[PDB]
Scaffold this active site. Structure first.
Site, short mmCIF file in Angstrom:
data_model
loop_
_atom_site.label_atom_id
_atom_site.label_comp_id
_atom_site.label_asym_id
_atom_site.label_seq_id
_atom_site.Cartn_x
_atom_site.Cartn_y
_atom_site.Cartn_z
N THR E 29 0.79 -1.24 0.00
CA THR E 29 0.00 0.00 0.00
C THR E 29 0.81 1.28 0.00
O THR E 29 1.96 1.29 0.42
CB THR E 29 -0.91 0.02 1.22
OG1 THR E 29 -0.14 -0.12 2.38
CG2 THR E 29 -1.92 -1.12 1.17
N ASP E 45 0.54 5.00 4.03
CA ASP E 45 -0.68 4.42 4.64
C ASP E 45 -0.41 3.29 5.65
O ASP E 45 0.54 2.53 5.48
CB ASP E 45 -1.55 3.86 3.50
CG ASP E 45 -2.84 3.19 3.97
OD1 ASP E 45 -3.42 3.65 4.97
OD2 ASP E 45 -3.28 2.21 3.32
N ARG E 47 -2.33 -0.06 8.16
CA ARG E 47 -3.42 -0.97 8.58
C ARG E 47 -2.89 -2.28 9.18
O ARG E 47 -1.78 -2.69 8.85
CB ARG E 47 -4.36 -1.26 7.38
CG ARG E 47 -3.71 -2.15 6.31
CD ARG E 47 -4.57 -2.28 5.05
NE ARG E 47 -4.57 -1.04 4.23
CZ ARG E 47 -5.17 -0.85 3.07
NH1 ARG E 47 -5.87 -1.78 2.50
NH2 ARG E 47 -5.07 0.29 2.45
N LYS E 50 5.57 2.21 8.60
CA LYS E 50 6.14 1.99 7.27
C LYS E 50 7.18 3.04 6.84
O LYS E 50 7.65 2.98 5.70
CB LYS E 50 5.00 1.81 6.25
CG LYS E 50 3.91 0.81 6.70
CD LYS E 50 4.44 -0.56 7.18
CE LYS E 50 3.31 -1.46 7.71
NZ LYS E 50 3.84 -2.72 8.28
N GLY E 64 6.69 -3.55 -0.41
CA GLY E 64 7.10 -4.94 -0.64
C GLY E 64 7.30 -5.70 0.67
O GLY E 64 6.60 -5.45 1.65
N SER E 146 0.59 0.23 -4.51
CA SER E 146 -0.67 0.00 -5.24
C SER E 146 -1.50 1.25 -5.55
O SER E 146 -2.22 1.29 -6.54
CB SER E 146 -1.55 -0.98 -4.46
OG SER E 146 -1.94 -0.40 -3.22
N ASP E 183 -10.57 1.35 -2.78
CA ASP E 183 -10.63 0.29 -1.76
C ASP E 183 -10.67 0.85 -0.31
O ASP E 183 -9.96 0.41 0.59
CB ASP E 183 -9.58 -0.81 -2.01
CG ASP E 183 -9.73 -1.49 -3.39
OD1 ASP E 183 -10.80 -1.39 -4.02
OD2 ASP E 183 -8.77 -2.17 -3.82
N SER E 186 -10.45 -0.29 4.39
CA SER E 186 -9.40 -1.32 4.64
C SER E 186 -8.31 -0.74 5.56
O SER E 186 -7.93 -1.45 6.52
CB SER E 186 -8.82 -1.80 3.34
OG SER E 186 -9.83 -2.30 2.48
#
Lengths: 233, 182, 232, 189, 218, 241, 249, 78, 237
Positions: E29, E45, E47, E50, E64, E146, E183, E186
């Protein structure tokens, strides 16, 4: 490259290490040694054997440096088991003598390493053989086969005594009389007596025996009254 | 097939195998195995060579546990690289400090267990239902051979192939004894 | 080296002869190690630092007379072998397998041309199931000897005299403490004795529940064994 | 150990405490190892579960000898994360679940990992094992923050009892370790 | 030595013999970077963390395989800490870019870290992205993962020369949040950091029948 | 053995290094370096007085990659060998770290190699002092000097050779008085003329295009002067005062 | 008699290693450095007596930051110190930090440094390192410490020490002053007094190097927003903060 | 059969020094690589002591790894 | 193997140069567009095969060498010179500049003057050629120390030879043409042999000139050599 005096000097440390004698018999081979005094407070129940197994059928003893001896016994043990693992039959006594000669000659050939202060007797039987084997290796990496031999302190006076009591044509007739000669040999030199003698007896196909403090006493209180009977005569 | 069977009683381990294929690692320890005809023999002898080198070097028996953990280590250490090959190992011994018979199974991945009775070979599925009803911790050696003879008869009832002739061996305080059903 | 005699190894055995004093005594229940720290200045920190006594695993301890820089490389080499033995055999390393491995390394530095020998003598204490409690010694030449009561370093021979004329084969570990402390107080040419100048360790059976129990001492337990033994 | 990638571990935290359970009693293929006060639940291949046991025993015994203090849950989390990453190309077939109490702060700790050592730190509960998707559904239905030691045991044991409920005897096991600052326990439920 | 392949033929055999393998954590993401009037911004992002630091002034956003992004960024974060200490000069973003490119080219995509690198150094401000191939890109704004088509589409529509902090932090957040309106439901929240050329790097987190009782002590 | 290998002596000394230090007086050459505002300038006394030599082949100023350069004194073989070790390292730092080798790091890197030869038994120190000069993108005008022991430090201005005590005293008495910690001129045309003036003051001998070697660093390049540019700077001193 | 191959630092007939005493004589000739442990922190200190009056004496940092929370200082061979310190920084990142995520304690990192000095004395063909090192630093459980290391690779924990030229006059002053109460502020003052006894040049914020592993410093971390990160405990006293404290003397 | 990068990285460090020395021959002539390999031979030959495992501090200066880490310096295979 | 001294001097170079003092004397002249190499032989016996015997070695199409000192040391440098200049062709696709050749040999000879396990080369070389810049001439010592030159000479005869090389270059302000140098060099070698003339020796001369040899190295033979001998004989008489 060092200098050749280092081999003569290594062999002088071998002369100051305690006496060891081995003899062939008709059907056995024996190694025996001047075990040092166990000092007071030294632990009896684990006291060093002086004679050492390389396998069931090869046995070894040394004079000179006891540290260098560990390393040669352990290079020999790993060669014996690695040989059996790679060639499907146990090591012959001469092959083991050629490997110990190989490493002793390696430390005598290299100028960046001292040569071992260790001479050895190496004894046993080949697999499936009843000719007893006996050998003698030196700081120089040289080796030779023997009927009877001595190394270490006072070893000349034991060589005198062997040349006065042993015959290459006619060994001590059976495994009992090897002990008489080898105990009596060490009694020329080991002035404190049956505490200081150690003997290990080998017979064809992997039987090897340490004689206890009781059997060496039985031989010493046999040889002593034979000496008294010869003194009364 | 090449079945191995091991059964532990009060004071012995009985090792059995289809018609070689066992090593006396020590005079108080055994290793009946099964697997691919090449690599299992080199592994069995490499294990015998180091365990015998320790046995010479100390003049001291390595425990059935310690050789079992050695065997799992060398199996893991030789599964790295190459690729997993089909092998199974039972280590059957007697421990002279604890006074107990002991039986460990080690499969090809290095999974080391210790259980009442252990087999490898696909007809082994016949034996487990037979050994769950009779197995007892109090058994003596001859009750061991009686369990084994039931197993070999039902293995024979369910195998018309060359299953003839198990070789059977007993481990206890008196060391390795090679023994017969006959 | 000359005339059938080692000159550097004889100088390494002379090197350890200044290196403080260390005693070990075996008893039916276990083993005592005790040692004297050489250095004293008010600024050198007396807690935390093991000077002389080191753990190799729970069941095995070593006392150093010699160069501590040398000792620490050998101590780490034995710790790796002890855990690598435990990883290989799932069972604690027998004391002899450990003292042989360190003694071989110490012969290797004695024979190799480039390398001076390690200037360290180790007394080992440990328990294993082959022989029970074992007490060993390993000198700069790489030779090792097993002992019921032993010393290394400064005043080796005077301390071995007092061991020889007091020791008994059947005593328990509490009786070894008073002898090891009195051996040290008879072997300290340094003028008087203190809880910070000692180091001590004991290996014991504990609850008998298969235990082995090392008792790493502190400045509180060593103070108590001093006043209990007869110095205040 | 058979169908062995199905072995599961629930880890959970409460008021100054932790609790790591695992299916078995059979008391076989035990998977909750103690390295001092730190506990490591492991789930996956029994060969890697025991290889990792020996490997972390080695590293922790050396750590304890070198550093003169036991390994804390955070430092054990970093040690397991870097040590699993050493096998980046053929990893251990495991999900380890570390647990314990950070001995200086008194705080609970749990973490899980993926096979290459990524750290999941979650302040409520953690699950691992190949079919445990159902048991994550169970645990999210019933956890509550700051439970006391014996009600922690009641919730983790009810999580375990609700899992795989075809037979609750003969093949049923749940080793409920309850981990506190002074005394740790091991119930063979 | 190093990263080993010990269980490479064993794990291929276990996975062939149906013993299906544990799954590595993949962060697929969005990550974004936005250069601005006095510095650079990067954001990502979250969830169920990062954003990773190479040095106090040089930061990465990862995509990745998650363990690989933390491992390579902290390895280069060690080499660059050692190199800053060795040279006694503040570390450069172009040193991070060379070390990461050279290091991911040691491997061959085997390591699956995808990476946006941004920072400040004694030269000014900089923004680059490295792919698992060892390929490099450079730009005034970048995105990877993505949401990248939608986040770049917004960044083209809104980016200016002379864009300030608050505008860029809004834009980085809307460039992510377009990538989460796709999406949506999520993930949520956004980790962002801001590297002002004269000042400390600023990081904003989340910017939005009673059973058996056999027992013993251990 | 205490004088043949680099090992501690009875007085804690290393005599091999004191002998590599005496090799730095062997060539009888003096060199001088000064920082300006936008440049750094280095002079060497070329000194080929009495031979069939070809002076367009006698040199001791070595440029290292683009923006960095050095004067060496000590034997010419060891000077060239040091230059080979200085040009390879500036070239491969620029590969590894993505920016031009800063002079401080080249001086450290040459000083750390000299610590190898200063501890090992079987290797000899190089018999040379290396004077690196550049204009950095950070610290601006730079001088760093490395010696046979592997010691290094940066400088405001420096002198090296048989007569360094004279040159250093005249430099010190100038910086002591003008108090800027560099030569305050906006162009390299006036820093070469200051350097040549203070070198001619210290050696007690005037200079020609035949006694001089000169190198200049500015932020784009390091460039050695040709003998005709030195001729302009001699004519310009003679014209000025 | 020795003659034994090419081995260096060989045992003399009296058992002394010999080469190492000459390394202690190189250490003894080097310019003083010292350090003090207080209750709440530790100090490390030395003098930069100049190798030329035209030198940039800011380019030779005699005090170095092994890692966040750990520092160092020396007497003797400057080149030897610098190589030990490039390796010490590297071994902290390789062995400890990249496995455990934390930095190594002082006890650990002092063993790692002392190992390199020990192993340079047992190999052929390398003299000892001609330096004594002080290492100071902080850890979660072990707390604060000062260490000394000698050319042999022997090391020990100290409360306070001084190494190099003035060391007997400095250690008689440190025993006459050190006490279990010390606050880091008074420890810096005792370190400043002790180098002001030993200095032969001028004494000011350019000729003394002085540092401290004390409180956490989040203004030095260089970033904000991750709550947990503590801020390197690094307050190397710059020449102005030194001249402020020299107003007291 | 084998991992794709198993042998790719097995020979990497020697493959890199071999390729570095080949460029030094091509640009600086025969003397410069011979000088580097002699120093490397002196440092591999002289610094043997059996317990060593950190290689040597001096070969890090010659290899130019004095402040840089591979995963091979984080994980000695031992 | 003994490597520094109280004068900062490299002891084994103090020994290795003593061989140069006992080697065959030689002269090199940098002519206005070329180099001329000239040498004295040591004809101890007629056994020495004439023509087959040669002192001036080809190093490349445009480069030559003459040397004094131990014969295998110099043969190894000529062999390494043949490797070195051929390595330049195989990448840069053009003949090597003579200062690049000279530096590569200076760096090579200096290498062995370092380590306590290798020997300083006991040989001094005069070498040179013609390239894209012009002619060049360099003399290299056992110390590694080399430098460009107007003309140079070395070996047994060096002091009488260097006095005559000054009498060339002080007397002509341009120096001399390639066809004048062929005469003038022979005058020196028969003059410097004054202290050894109780033995006889063979004259050998070779050259490279941009004009007179098309910039490719060639020997001097026949009428030019005979004219140089008829010059050297009338000049010494």
């Amino acid at each position: 490259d060092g200098h050749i005096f280092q081999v003569e000097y290594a062999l002088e440390a071998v002369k100051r290490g305690t006496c060891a004698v081995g003899v062939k018999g008709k059907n056995c081979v024996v190694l025996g040694c001047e075990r040092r005094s166990t000092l007071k407070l030294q632990d009896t129940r684990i006291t060093p054997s002086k004679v050492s197994k390389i396998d069931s059928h090869v046995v070894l003893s040394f004079s000179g440096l006891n540290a260098d001896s560990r390393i040669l016994i352990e290079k020999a043990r790993v060669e014996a088991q690695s040989h059996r693992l790679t060639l499907e039959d146990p090591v012959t006594v001469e092959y083991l003598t050629r490997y110990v000669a190989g490493v002793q000659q390696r430390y005598t050939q290299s100028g960046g390493v001292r040569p071992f202060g260790v001479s050895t007797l190496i004894a046993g039987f080949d697999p499936r053989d009843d000719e007893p084997k006996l050998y003698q290796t030196e700081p120089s990496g040289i080796y030779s086969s023997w009927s009877a031999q001595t190394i270490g302190r006072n070893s000349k006076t034991v060589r005198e005594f062997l040349e006065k009591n042993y015959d290459r044509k006619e060994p001590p007739a059976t495994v009992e009389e090897c002990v008489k000669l080898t105990v009596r040999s060490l009694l020329e030199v080991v002035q404190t007596g049956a505490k200081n003698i150690e003997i290990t007896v080998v017979k064809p196909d992997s039987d090897i025996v340490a004689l206890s403090s009781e059997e060496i006493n039985q031989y010493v209180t046999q040889i002593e009254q034979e000496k008294q009977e010869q003194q009364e005569q | 097939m090449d079945i191995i069977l091991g059964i532990r009683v009060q004071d012995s381990v009985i090792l059995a195998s289809s018609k070689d294929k066992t090593r006396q690692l020590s005079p108080h320890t055994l290793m009946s195995f099964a697997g691919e005809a090449g690599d299992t023999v080199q592994f069995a002898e490499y294990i015998q060579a180091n365990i015998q080198l320790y046995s010479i070097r100390e003049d001291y028996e390595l425990s059935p546990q310690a050789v079992s953990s050695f065997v799992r280590q060398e199996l893991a250490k030789s599964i790295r690289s190459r690729r997993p090959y089909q092998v199974n190992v039972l280590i059957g011994g007697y421990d002279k400090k604890k006074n107990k018979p002991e039986l460990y199974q080690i499969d090809y991945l290095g999974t080391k267990v210790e259980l009442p009775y252990g087999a490898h070979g696909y007809s082994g599925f016949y034996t487990f239902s037979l050994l769950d009803h009779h197995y007892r911790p109090d058994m003596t050696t001859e009750e061991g051979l009686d369990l084994l003879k039931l197993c070999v008869q039902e293995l024979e009832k369910r195998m018309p192939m060359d299953f003839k002739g198990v070789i059977v061996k007993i481990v206890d305080k008196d060391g390795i004894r090679q023994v017969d059903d006959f | 080296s000359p005339e059938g005699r080692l000159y550097q190894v004889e100088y390494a055995l002379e090197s350890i002869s200044h290196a403080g004093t260390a005693i070990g005594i075996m008893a039916s229940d276990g083993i005592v190690l005790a040692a004297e720290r050489k250095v004293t200045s008010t600024l050198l920190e007396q807690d935390t630092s093991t000077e002389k006594l080191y753990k190799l695993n729970d069941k095995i301890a070593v006392a150093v007379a010699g160069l501590t820089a040398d000792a620490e490389i050998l101590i780490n080499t034995a710790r790796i072998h002890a855990q690598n033995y435990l990883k290989t055999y799932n069972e604690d390393i027998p004391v002899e397998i450990l003292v042989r491995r360190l003694s071989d390394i110490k012969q290797g530095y004695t024979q190799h041309g480039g390398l001076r020998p390690f200037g360290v003598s180790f007394i080992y204490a440990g328990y294993d199931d082959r022989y029970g409690y074992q007490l060993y010694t390993s000198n700069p030449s790489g030779n090792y000897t097993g002992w019921k009561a032993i010393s290394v370093g400064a005043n080796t021979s005077a301390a071995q005299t007092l061991l020889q004329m007091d020791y008994k084969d059947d005593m328990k570990v509490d009786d070894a403490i008073e002898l090891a402390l009195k051996t040290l107080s008879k072997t300290t040419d340094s003028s008087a004795l203190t809880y910070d100048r000692l180091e001590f360790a004991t290996i014991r059976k504990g609850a008998n529940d298969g235990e082995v129990y090392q008792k790493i001492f502190k400045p509180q337990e060593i103070k108590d064994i001093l006043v209990k033994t007869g110095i205040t | 150990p058979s169908s062995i990638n199905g072995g599961i571990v629930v880890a959970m935290t409460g008021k100054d405490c932790v609790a790591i359970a695992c299916d078995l009693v059979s008391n076989k293929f035990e998977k909750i190892f103690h390295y001092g006060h730190v506990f490591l639940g492991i789930t996956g291949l029994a060969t890697d579960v025991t290889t990792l046991n020996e490997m972390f025993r080695y590293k922790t015994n050396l750590y304890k000898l070198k550093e003169e203090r036991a390994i804390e849950p955070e430092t054990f989390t970093q040690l397991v994360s870097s040590s699993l990453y050493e096998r980046r190309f053929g990893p251990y077939f495991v999900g380890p679940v570390v647990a314990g109490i950070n001995s200086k702060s008194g705080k609970p700790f749990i973490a899980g990992f993926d096979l290459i050592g990524c750290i999941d730190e979650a302040k409520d509960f953690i699950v691992s094992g190949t079919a445990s998707d159902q048991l994550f559904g169970m645990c999210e239905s019933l956890y509550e923050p700051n439970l006391e030691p014996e009600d922690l045991f009641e919730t983790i044991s009810q999580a375990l009892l609700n899992a795989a409920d075809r037979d609750a005897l003969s093949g049923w096991g749940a080793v409920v370790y309850i981990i506190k600052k002074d005394e740790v326990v091991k119930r063979y439920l | 030595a190093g990263l080993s392949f010990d269980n490479y033929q064993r794990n291929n055999f276990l996975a062939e013999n149906s013993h299906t393998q544990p799954k590595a954590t993949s962060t697929g993401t969005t990550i974004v970077g936005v250069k601005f009037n006095n510095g650079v911004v990067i954001a990502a992002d979250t969830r169920s963390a990062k954003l990773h630091r190479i040095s106090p002034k040089i930061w990465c956003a990862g995509a990745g395989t998650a363990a690989d992004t933390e491992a390579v960024t902290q390895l280069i974060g060690s080499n660059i800490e050692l190199h800053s200490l060795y040279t006694s000069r503040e570390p450069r973003v172009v040193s991070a870019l060379q070390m990461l490119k050279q290091h991911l080219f040691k491997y061959q995509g085997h390591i699956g870290a995808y990476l946006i690198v941004a920072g400040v150094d004694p030269t000014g401000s900089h923004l680059f992205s490295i792919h698992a191939h060892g390929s490099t890109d450079v730009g005034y704004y970048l995105s990877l993962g993505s949401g990248s088509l939608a986040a770049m589409a917004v960044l083209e529509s809104h980016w200016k020369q002379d864009l300030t902090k608050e505008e860029a932090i809004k834009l980085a957040s809307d460039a992510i949040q377009a990538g989460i309106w796709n999406d949506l439901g999520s993930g949520s929240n956004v980790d962002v950091c801001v590297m002002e050329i004269g000042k400390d790097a600023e990081y904003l987190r989340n910017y939005l029948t009673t059973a058996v009782l056999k027992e013993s002590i251990v | 053995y205490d004088r043949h290998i680099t090992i501690f002596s009875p007085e804690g000394r290393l005599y091999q290094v004191e002998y590599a230090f005496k090799a730095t007086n062997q060539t009888n050459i003096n060199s001088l370096a000064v920082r300006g505002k936008d440049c750094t300038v280095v002079i060497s006394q070329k000194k080929v007085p009495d031979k069939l030599l070809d002076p367009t082949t006698v040199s001791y100023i070595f440029c290292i990659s683009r923006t960095i350069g050095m004067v060496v004194n000590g034997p010419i073989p060891d000077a060239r060998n040091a230059a080979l070790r200085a040009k390879a390292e500036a070239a491969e730092f620029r590969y590894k770290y993505g920016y031009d080798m800063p002079c401080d790091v080249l001086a450290k890197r040459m000083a750390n190699l000299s610590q190898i030869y200063t501890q090992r038994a079987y290797m000899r120190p190089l018999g040379v002092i290396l004077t690196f000069v550049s204009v950095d993108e950070e610290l601006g005008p730079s001088i760093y000097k490395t010696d046979p022991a592997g010691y290094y430090v940066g400088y405001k201005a420096t002198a090296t050779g048989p007569k360094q005590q004279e040159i250093t005293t005249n430099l010190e008495n100038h910086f002591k008085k003008s108090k800027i910690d560099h030569i305050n001129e906006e162009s390299w045309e006036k820093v070469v003329e200051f350097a040549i003036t203070h070198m001619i003051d210290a050696l007690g001998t005037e200079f020609s295009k035949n006694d001089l070697e000169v190198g200049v660093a500015t932020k784009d390049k390091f460039f050695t002067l040709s003998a005709e540019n030195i001729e302009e700077r001699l004519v310009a001193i003679a014209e000025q005062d | 008699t020795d003659r034994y191959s090419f081995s260096l630092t060989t045992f003399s007939p009296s058992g002394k290693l010999g080469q190492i005493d000459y390394a202690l004589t190189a250490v003894k000739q080097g310019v003083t450095s010292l350090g003090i442990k207080a209750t709440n922190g530790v100090v490390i200190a030395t003098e930069k007596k100049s190798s030329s009056p035209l030198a940039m004496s800011e380019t030779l940092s005699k005090v170095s930051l092994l890692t966040p929370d750990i520092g160092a200082v020396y007497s003797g061979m400057g080149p030897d110190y610098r190589v030990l310190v490039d390796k010490s920084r590297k071994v902290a990142h390789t062995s400890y930090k990249r496995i455990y995520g934390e930095y190594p304690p002082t006890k650990l990192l002092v063993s790692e440094v002392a190992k390199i000095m020990q192993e340079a004395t047992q190999s052929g063909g390398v003299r000892p390192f001609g330096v004594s090192l002080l290492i100071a630093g902080h850890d979660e459980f072990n707390g604060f410490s000062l260490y000394q290391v000698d050319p042999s690779g022997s090391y020990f924990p100290w409360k306070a020490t001084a190494i190099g030229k003035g060391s007997v006059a400095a250690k008689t002053f440190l025993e006459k002053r050190w006490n279990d109460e010390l606050e880091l502020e008074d420890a810096i003052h005792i370190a400043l007094l002790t180098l002001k006894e030993s200095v032969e040049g001028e004494f000011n914020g350019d000729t003394i190097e002085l540092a401290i592993i004390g409180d956490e410093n989040p203004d030095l971390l260089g970033y904000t927003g991750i709550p947990t990160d503590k801020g390197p405990r690094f307050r190397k006293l710059t020449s102005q903060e030194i001249n402020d404290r020299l107003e007291a003397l | 059969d084998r991992h794709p990068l198993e042998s790719t990285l097995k020979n990497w460090e020697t493959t890199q020094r071999q390729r570095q020395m080949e460029q030094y021959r091509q640009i600086f002539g025969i003397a410069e690589p011979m000088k580097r390999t002699m120093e490397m031979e002196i440092v591999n030959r002289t610094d043997f002591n059996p317990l060593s495992t950190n290689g040597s501090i001096h070969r890090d200066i010659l290899l130019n790894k004095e402040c840089s880490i591979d995963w091979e310096d984080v994980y000695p295979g031992t | 193997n003994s490597v520094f001294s109280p004068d900062g001097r490299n002891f084994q170079v103090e020994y290795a140069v003593k061989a140069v003092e006992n080697g065959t004397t030689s002269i090199g002249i940098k002519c206005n567009d070329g180099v001329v190499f000239a040498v004295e032989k040591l004809i101890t016996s007629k056994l020495l095969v004439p023509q087959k015997n040669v002192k001036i070695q080809v190093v490349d199409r445009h480069i030559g060498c003459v040397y004094s000192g131990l014969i295998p040391d110099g043969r190894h440098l000529v062999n390494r010179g043949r490797e070195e200049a051929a390595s330049f062709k195989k990448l840069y696709k053009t003949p090597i500049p003579i200062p690049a050749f000279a530096d590569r040999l200076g760096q090579y000879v200096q290498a062995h003057t370092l380590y306590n396990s290798v020997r300083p080369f006991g040989v001094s070389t005069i070498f040179g050629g013609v390239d894209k810049n012009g002619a060049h001439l360099y003399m290299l010592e056992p110390s590694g120390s080399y430098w460009g030159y107007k003309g140079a000479a070395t070996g047994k005869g060096r002091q009488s030879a260097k006095a005559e090389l000054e009498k060339l270059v002080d007397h002509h302000p341009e120096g001399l043409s390639a066809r004048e140098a062929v005469k003038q060099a022979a005058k020196i070698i028969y003059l410097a042999h004054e202290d050894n003339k109780e033995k006889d020796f063979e004259l050998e001369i070779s050259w490279c000139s941009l004009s007179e040899t098309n910039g490719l190295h060639k020997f001097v033979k026949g009428d030019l050599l005979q004219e140089a001998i008829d010059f050297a004989q009338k000049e010494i008489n």
